[PDB]
Amino acid sequence: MELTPDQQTLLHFIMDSYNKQRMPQEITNKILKEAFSAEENFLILTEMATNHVQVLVEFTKKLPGFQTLDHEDQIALLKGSAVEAMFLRSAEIFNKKLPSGHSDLLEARIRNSGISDEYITPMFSFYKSIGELKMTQEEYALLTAIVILSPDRQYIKDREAVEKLQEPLLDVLQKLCKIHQPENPQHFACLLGRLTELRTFNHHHAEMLMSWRVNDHKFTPLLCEIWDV
């Protein structure tokens, strides 16, 4: 029912590794400060996406048991979760409470960033769906770890070894759901449901970058490897 000392240890360790990320206030303040062209926003996106991959590899290496997995499976998990984890992190930043009228301006700035209108509606539908869940910092950290340690990822040789590492993270998350929302017993299932909505963003990620309203789509070598561009 309640968290065990081992689970609390796992939780604080996941929280410490996760907090090594970029400040949500820093990112939203830049977007809200002034309007940028589709070209400036494309450059901001590639820089933010390159840094996110680097921070994600460090968070993943610290995930208990990750370094014991086969080296090829290690790459397949990272390649399979990188884009999903970046969208989950954008949804987290999107739903952070801000002064009156700021989240309306943040939405309008993201709508006019340069992204193709075809992707605007599915993106905001996911962001709003995440927001309705009123997720805590610990829930975002554990859900990101669960997304990375997905055994049902493509090209995984040893799925059972991945399952063994994901299961204790799922157990901690379920206990937090029962504690933070005892009136909503559907909460844990709702979180796992939102992960299938995440997976549907992975299908058109390359197109989302290529269809950006710019003439030149320049990427860093690391981005070319993670996003398939």
């Binding site: 680097q54 590899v57 290496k61 080296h71 290690q74 790459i75 990272l78 390649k79 070598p221 690391l222 490897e225 993670i226």
Partner: peptide, 11 residues
């Protein structure tokens, strides 16, 4: 061949 990712994982 994911050379940069392999490098970021190994060292």
């Amino acid at each position: 061949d994911h050379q940069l990712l392999r490098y970021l994982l190994d060292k």
